[PDB]
Write a protein that binds this ligand. Structure first.
Ligand SMILES: CCCCCCCCCCCCO[C@@H]1O[C@H](CO)[C@@H](O[C@H]2O[C@H](CO)[C@@H](O)[C@H](O)[C@H]2O)[C@H](O)[C@H]1O
Ligand SMILES: CCCCCCCCCCCCO[C@@H]1O[C@H](CO)[C@@H](O[C@H]2O[C@H](CO)[C@@H](O)[C@H](O)[C@H]2O)[C@H](O)[C@H]1O
Ligand SMILES: CCCCCCCCCCCCO[C@@H]1O[C@H](CO)[C@@H](O[C@H]2O[C@H](CO)[C@@H](O)[C@H](O)[C@H]2O)[C@H](O)[C@H]1O
Lengths: 189, 87, 36, 75, 40, 75
């Protein structure tokens, strides 16, 4: 007699608002806009450190802590630091890097439409999943929850055994970036 | 949809750049953060750990291009004294 | 709400307040006054 | 002193009118100076000028940079 | 056979071919060496 | 004819046209990484347009042939 389907809020085991994702998208976009329009390369790298943070939080917020923390440790931690070193030691006259940006507005208009109209069709349904709105539903499992692993233990269970060839190539790419970058910069002895 | 927009930002960094070889360095990394970010969000959708791992190896190759890229840019600056493009 | 959220906001409030004592109570003189 | 108050705004509408019956600098053997000859002096401290704001370089000095090494590869 | 509206199809080529050439002029302005502006 | 239209409509005409054509195309190659990047993206867009709109193959050749003529024309 009464409606069989019943919808009610969750009092304690709740979760996060999906509103935060829409905020973190906006700032990531806003931060990214300032990267490619800023006059000073120091400032653009700062807007890059901001973008890497917003994307890192976006991922932590949706459950991907190890890689979201890996982005923090790797990009903001170390790559942008190397960028800051070089950019704070190279002499930069901030007017020789400034080009007439107003000319390229029409080409910005043109290439924005063409790329956006094509690539968006390529994306899968799950990524563009976000008036009757579809709700995603989840339920518990017991056989699959016996000894659950964090994402880093799951990556580790296969990173060094089944897909270990990927580790070999990466070890050699990092090793080449060591030898090659040392040999093209330093004066021997 | 955020992944595609952030890809455009990297593209548009190549559209608006006549003088910054540093912004060309930057926009390549914005483009890499789009593609890694897209792989990751689809991995959460399909319950696959290989998408997570593929992101990890993209992050490691991305840092290595920064070392090679900033190393070569140092070698150029030593003999040039300027990163500027006369135009 | 979660605990991690209330914790960052709390620290954020304290970090703002020490600005407030400085900007409210500390004096403020308007006068704020090439090689390779 | 916030620089704006009720009476100070009214001061904005008036213009200075020089009293013609009153003595001036000349009567004291003095010459006033204008403010245009002094702005550079009293505003020079308020001039943010770093290596960034410098003009784009010329071709002659770009050549001068090729006689220097701009990196110390042994330090 | 099935006749085709020549005027309609003719415009399509003008927009298709002309549309591409509009993108070429966009390249020309972006690579302009002076402050020529967007409406150039 | 022999020393005229046969050579103007032939080896001497082709010589004069092609040398001018190639001087113009090589006037594009400026060793400016900023300009090269735009050219790669331009060449990327045309590939996407071609092989997504299902444009007529003839539409492409008109563009290609029309381009070659503009490189024949100077200034
Ligand atoms: C972020 C949270 C919101 C903001 C909270 C903090 C608000 C800060 C502003 C209010 C307090 C201002 O603090 C006060 O500023 C004025 C103006 O600069 C200073 O005033 C000083 O310079 C002015 C210049 O016009 C003089 O006329 C004045 O006689 C002199 O005392 C005071 O020395 C300073 O103590
Ligand atoms: C159906 C159409 C015909 C089919 C294809 C026919 C193509 C034949 C055209 C070849 C054009 C001549 O090719 C070009 O000629 C000039 C001379 O004119 C040569 O130029 C040479 O001769 C000149 C003579 O003063 C000297 O400066 C020098 O010995 C050398 O530069 C070039 O080395 C050659 O590249
Ligand atoms: C018996 C017939 C034998 C036929 C042999 C094979 C013919 C080969 C076909 C193409 C020959 C080249 O054809 C020739 O093109 C060149 C440009 O490249 C033209 O060369 C010239 O064009 C105009 C004049 O018309 C000039 O202002 C221009 O400066 C110049 O490029 C010739 O006017 C044209 O006749």
């Amino acid at each position: 007699s009464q409606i069989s389907l019943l919808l009610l809020k969750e009092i304690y085991t709740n979760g996060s608002t999906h509103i935060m994702l829409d905020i973190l998208s906006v700032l990531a976009v806003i931060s990214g806009i300032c990267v490619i329009i800023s006059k000073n390369p120091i400032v653009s790298v700062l807007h890059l450190i901001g973008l890497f943070a917003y994307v890192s939080f976006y991922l932590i917020l949706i459950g991907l802590n190890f890689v979201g923390l890996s982005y923090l440790i790797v990009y903001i931690g170390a790559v942008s630091i190397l960028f800051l070193f070089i950019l704070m030691l190279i002499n930069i006259r901030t007017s020789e890097l400034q080009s007439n940006t107003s000319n390229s507005i029409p080409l910005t208009i043109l290439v924005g439409i063409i790329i956006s109209s094509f690539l968006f069709k390529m994306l899968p349904y799950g990524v563009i999943i976000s008036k009757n709105d579809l709700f995603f539903i989840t339920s518990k499992i017991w056989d699959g929850a016996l000894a659950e692993n964090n994402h880093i233990s799951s990556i580790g269970n296969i990173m060094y055994t089944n897909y270990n060839v990927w580790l070999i190539l990466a070890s050699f790419i990092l090793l080449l970036a060591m030898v090659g970058a040392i040999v093209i910069t330093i004066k021997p002895r | 949809n955020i992944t595609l927009i952030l890809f455009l930002i990297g593209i548009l960094g190549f559209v608006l750049n006549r003088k910054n070889i540093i912004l060309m360095l930057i926009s390549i990394e914005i483009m890499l953060l789009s593609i890694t970010f897209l792989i990751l969000l689809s991995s959460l959708n399909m319950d696959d750990i290989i998408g997570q791992t593929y992101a990890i190896y993209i992050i490691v190759v991305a840092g290595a291009e920064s070392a090679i890229g900033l190393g070569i840019l140092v070698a150029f600056y030593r003999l040039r004294g300027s990163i500027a493009i006369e135009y | 709400m979660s605990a991690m959220s209330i914790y960052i906001i709390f620290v954020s409030i304290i970090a703002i307040l020490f600005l407030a004592i400085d900007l409210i109570f500390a004096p403020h003189n308007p006068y704020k006054e090439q090689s390779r | 002193d916030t620089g704006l108050s009720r009476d100070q705004v009214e001061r904005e509408f008036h213009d200075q009118v020089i009293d013609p019956t009153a003595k001036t600098f000349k009567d004291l053997g003095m010459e006033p100076t204008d403010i245009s000859k002094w702005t550079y002096h009293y505003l020079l401290p308020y001039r943010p000028s770093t290596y960034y704001d410098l003009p784009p370089s010329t071709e002659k000095e770009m050549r001068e940079e090729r006689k220097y090494l701009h990196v110390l590869d042994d330090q | 056979y099935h006749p085709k509206d020549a005027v309609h199809l003719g415009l399509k080529g003008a927009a298709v071919v002309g549309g591409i050439g509009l993108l070429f002029a966009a390249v020309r302005t972006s690579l302009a060496r002076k402050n020529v502006g967007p409406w150039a | 004819l022999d020393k005229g239209s046969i050579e103007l409509f032939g080896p001497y005409g082709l010589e004069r046209g092609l040398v001018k054509l190639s001087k113009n195309i090589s006037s594009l190659s400026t060793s400016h990484v900023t300009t090269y990047a735009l050219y790669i993206l331009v060449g990327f867009i045309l590939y996407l347009i071609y092989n997504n709109l299902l444009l007529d193959y003839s539409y492409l050749l008109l563009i290609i042939i029309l381009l070659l003529l503009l490189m024949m024309i100077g200034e």
